[PDB]
C-alpha cells in the first residue's frame, strides 16, 4: 500500500464557499459545514496544481523515482538508499547517449561510488600526414579499472566487478582493482 490519505490543514484553489451564490454567503452553518467538505477534497487539487514536479526525478516522491527509472532504463536494482537513486534516474538518459565510450565507463563507475576512477585501455587517436602510417594504439587488448576508495570494505571488488561487467563493450577482458 501507499497510505495516500487526506491531509489535515491544507487549503484549496477552488473553495466550495467561493462558488456559492450571493445571499447564501450570509449563513453561519452553511459556510462552516460546506467548508468541511473542502477537507476531504483538498489534496486532489494539490496534485493537479503541481503535476510537473510529480515527474521531475530530483523532487518527485520515492515511489515514482523507481517507476521513472523504468522509463529510461536506469538499472535501479540493488539500491536501498533513496539519495543514491535520485542521481541515477536523472543522469541515466545522458549515459546511454555515450554508453560504451571513454567517459561512459568512468562516469558510470563514478556514479555508483562517488569518486572518479583511473582507467587505462588499449586505444587512442592520432593523425599523420605521412601516407600509410601506423596506428600505435597497443599490441593486445586490455581494460583496467582503478578506484581510489578511502574505505575499501572487501565487497567493492565484487560491486566493481558486476558494474564494469555491463560497461565493457563485450569485446575485451577486464580486471578490477580497489584501493
Amino acid at each position: 500500500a501507499s497510505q495516500r490519505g487526506s491531509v489535515d490543514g491544507l487549503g484549496s484553489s477552488l473553495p466550495i464557499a467561493s462558488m456559492l451564490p450571493a445571499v447564501f454567503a450570509d449563513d453561519d452553518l452553511a459556510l462552516r459545514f460546506v467548508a468541511g467538505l473542502d477537507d476531504v477534497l483538498a489534496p486532489i487539487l494539490n496534485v493537479l496544481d503541481c503535476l510537473d514536479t510529480y515527474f521531475d526525478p530530483a523532487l518527485t516522491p520515492a515511489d515514482f523515482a523507481q517507476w521513472l527509472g523504468t522509463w529510461v532504463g536506469a538499472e535501479t536494482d540493488g539500491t536501498e538508499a533513496e539519495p543514491m537513486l535520485r542521481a541515477a534516474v536523472a543522469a541515466a538518459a545522458r549515459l546511454h547517449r555515450v554508453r560504451g565510450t571513454l567517459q561512459g565507463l568512468s562516469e558510470t563507475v563514478r556514479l555508483a561510488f562517488g569518486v572518479a576512477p583511473e582507467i587505462t585501455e588499449s586505444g587512442g587517436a592520432t593523425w599523420n600526414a605521412r601516407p600509410l602510417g601506423p596506428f600505435p594504439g597497443r599490441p593486445r587488448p586490455q581494460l583496467h579499472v582503478a578506484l581510489r576508495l578511502p574505505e575499501p570494505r572487501p565487497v567493492d571488488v565484487h560491486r566493481l566487478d558486476a558494474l564494469v561487467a555491463a560497461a565493457r563493450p563485450a569485446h575485451m577482458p577486464y580486471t578490477v582493482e580497489v584501493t
Partner: peptide
Amino acid sequence: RLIGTRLAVG
C-alpha cells in the same frame, strides 16, 4: 570513439 578501438587517419 568506442572503447579500445585504435584509429589513425591520412
